[PDB]
Amino acid sequence: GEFMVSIMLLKVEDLHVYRGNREILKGVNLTVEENEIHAIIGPNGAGKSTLAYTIMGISGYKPTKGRIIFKGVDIIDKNITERARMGMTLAWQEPARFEGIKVKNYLMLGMNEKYKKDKEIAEEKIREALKLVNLDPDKYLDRYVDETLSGGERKRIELASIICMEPDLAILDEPDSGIDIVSFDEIKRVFDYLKDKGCSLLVITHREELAEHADRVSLICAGEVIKSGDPKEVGEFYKKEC
Amino acid sequence: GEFMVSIMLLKVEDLHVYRGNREILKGVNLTVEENEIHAIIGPNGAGKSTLAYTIMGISGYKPTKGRIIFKGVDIIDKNITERARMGMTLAWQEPARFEGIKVKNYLMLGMNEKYKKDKEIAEEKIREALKLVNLDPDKYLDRYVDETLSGGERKRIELASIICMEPDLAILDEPDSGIDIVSFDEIKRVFDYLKDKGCSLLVITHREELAEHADRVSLICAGEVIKSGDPKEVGEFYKKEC
Amino acid sequence: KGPRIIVKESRIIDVQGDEGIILEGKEEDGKIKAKIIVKKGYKFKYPIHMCFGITEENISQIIDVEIILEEDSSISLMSHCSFPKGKGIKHIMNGIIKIGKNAKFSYNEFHYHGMDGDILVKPTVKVEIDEGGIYISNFTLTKGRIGTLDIEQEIIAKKDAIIDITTRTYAIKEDVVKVNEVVKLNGENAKCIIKSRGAAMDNSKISLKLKIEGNAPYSKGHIDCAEIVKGNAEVESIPIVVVRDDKARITHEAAIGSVDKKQLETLMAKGLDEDEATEIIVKGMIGDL
Amino acid sequence: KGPRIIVKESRIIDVQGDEGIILEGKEEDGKIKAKIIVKKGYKFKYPIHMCFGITEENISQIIDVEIILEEDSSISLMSHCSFPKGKGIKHIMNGIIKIGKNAKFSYNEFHYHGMDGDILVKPTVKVEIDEGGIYISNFTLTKGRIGTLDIEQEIIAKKDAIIDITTRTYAIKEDVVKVNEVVKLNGENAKCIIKSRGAAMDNSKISLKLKIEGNAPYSKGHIDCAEIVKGNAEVESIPIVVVRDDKARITHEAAIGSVDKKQLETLMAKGLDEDEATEIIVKGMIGDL
């Protein structure tokens, strides 16, 4: 209902999303609070990606029943651009390749107003973001975000984009996949940096080990939130009950 | 030299592999012993994939200096087929899709003579291999190993193939990537099963958490084996010194 | 025992049609004139048959057929060709298919030939699809010598139509395969896929011209072509894409020549030799496995 | 101050060639006859220039050039065209390029035009590549109105040759873009890539015919075509693949029509509107971004 909504950034109420004849999300009740790293775990086919695309307003992910409230506003009639302008962003699992867009210009797209305006401060933010994702800024600034990059380079540049954007809500679809991750300390270093800045992360993942580093974890099984709360408790339940 | 070679399955001696003008492997000294899960860790561009392809005899991965001895035989003039007939196999990171080959027929290719020998045993091994990788045998046996499958389904079928084959040496390039892994208990269940059967696994990985479950770990940095020994020992060194 | 059209040699053997499926047939000027009419609302789950047998030398099996599907109807036609003698055979089919509003037609033709390549299989199919219509077409010629295959199709699609056209061939000796298919997406949101799979060996000659025109907003199309070349076989792949709307999008992908190196090397890592591995790939490609 | 060939209007302004790079030039029958000869062993790291300026009305800048590169030589040619007035202009280049054993030639042509489209840019390039030779070609026309672009190229390659041909275009108003390139991989292990990138707006007409013939063992090729359609623009993509060897392999991929939905939606998730996001994609496509 209306209980504790004043400290809630995102509120998904009994959401039903259909993909063709199949109902993928069968009543999703999920909330994201301010300054929280809330992870979403679940098996293949549970609706993890569908949920992330429905919140962002991606075409073809329209709810049949339910509502998505972001910042107190029901975003039912808002498009991707309008939802992004409210402080919500999505990092896809396989970030799109773009013909002829340099890294230095790509990282300026959607950049936070606190960096975006001053040029020498915006250019410094790019360096800090590329250095956080273990990429040499001078080796990548003039590279294109095209097919030429490795999947790990392109996904690290996408992680740097989330850093430059510094959103109120960052939806991260499988952030540790395809980056050639050395250890969870690499991704935790980025997660804690965004958290300290005031961001909330909606980390979508199938890897229980990644979810344990989050503040809260929700287990989605067949389009429904089965258990939610403590990361280690709901995590151990996920590994056991599948 | 010749010390402890009688219990060694694989012996890579000062191996130099060139890919174009660049020398990728700059003197690799690595050994794989009988009944051992020997993991190889290293950053991107260290030569992990190149090493796995050079041992298997993949075209375009020819050594300039050094030798690869498998089962006491120097396999310098042996092709992929000839190396596979000696008990060595490779599971690629992105297993190839095939037009019109069913799962039930794909899992019979290269299957161990202990099971291939009898129809009832071969059909039983195909069910336990698919059940071990958490796939419903009846839901996948008549599916094609083509583009239609998800990356996770195709890579789980590839792990099932390694099980059916039961090689003396199984080279596994990034076995926990692209499978939608719930936890390391899923991959360890498969690793222990192969180990109990007498297989040696040459697990190639960039993820330190995965290498911790192996018996021995070798750190490859810029085509050379820097540290080798205990999993937490060399694993922690890799996270710090990179 | 089923709505079927049997043609042995150049003569009609049987012409039987059930309730809601009018099957007419006659012989005029050396050709067979068939007319299939699926009545409005009739959705048949059992496939209609059309058997063509040729055992005599120098037979010219010419069939002009018109298939009409009325609004909300559904039918599947399974054409079977058995030409084992193959000395002077000529199977020619000229078809006019009209798929009504929200109707669904599926066509599957399978050929079984002998080792004589004096066969000419020549289908020409004109297809007109109304708002919401569906057309699924499959031609398979992987048994015996093809001889000379000459397929020509032209499909005109209106709003919300769905087209799926496929060809699986196995060309050997001096076989000639000619495929010319055009799909015009002339209505909003009309979708199409043209797929070609096959293997060409010995002195075979393959020409695959596959075309999609995205002429309306939200029309989408994809051409997928894959052809293995073995021996002295020659292949030509001409996949045309025309776009006349800024909200239309068509893609194509093709791979022609030797088997994919990763596929070959993956099977060789299982202990199969290069010839066993290639044979597996080719058999899967032609639908044998 | 550099081996360059300057042509203002239909006249040669300058003809200077350095040591090991013979640059000849004369005017005969209304055409310019140039001849560039790169001497055996000479690998020049600095690019040769070729400027073409046209400010007069009704100019027919016809240039017949022959470029010969001897064994183990290397050169890069940077042709620049400035046609700002654009009324009745006609730039025609007919070139014969002969790349010797282990020689390397690179050609880059950039155009800067005004807003009137009475320009005809017509390059015809015949390229013969010997064992181990390299040919790199780039035509960019993304500034002002193209007018009518008519590119024709035919490349014949021997053992171990490498070919890389690219085209970047930005067609507006009633612009016509015609591209016809054929690459014949006639020697063992000869490799090729033909790439086309571009955006077509308003009432432009694009025709891209790109062809690769894999005629020898171990020859490999790839055709990559991507073209954005905006407004009432019309595009035709004809990418032909011919394979005449069982150890040859050629692939092709193309995407024609509206911008990729994932690319558009990824930029809109950054706060850009559909028009800003499309503008970014199109600018990157044409090499502006």
Numbering used by the authors:
A (entry chain A), B (entry chain C): -2 to 239
C (entry chain D), D (entry chain B): 28 to 316
Sentences from the study reporting this entry:
The present study focuses on the ancestor SMS from the hyperthermophilic archaeon Methanocaldococcus jannaschii. Biochemical and structural studies showed that SMS is made of a SmsC2B2 heterotetratmer wherein the SmsC subunit hosts both ATP and [Fe-S] cluster binding sites. With respect to the six components of the SUF system, SMS has only two components, SmsC and SmsB, encoded by the smsCB operon. The SmsC subunit, consisting of a RecA-like domain and a helical domain, contains all the structural motifs of the nucleotide-binding (NBD) subunits of the ABC ATPases (i.e., Walker A, Walker B, ABC signature, D-, Q-, and H-loops).
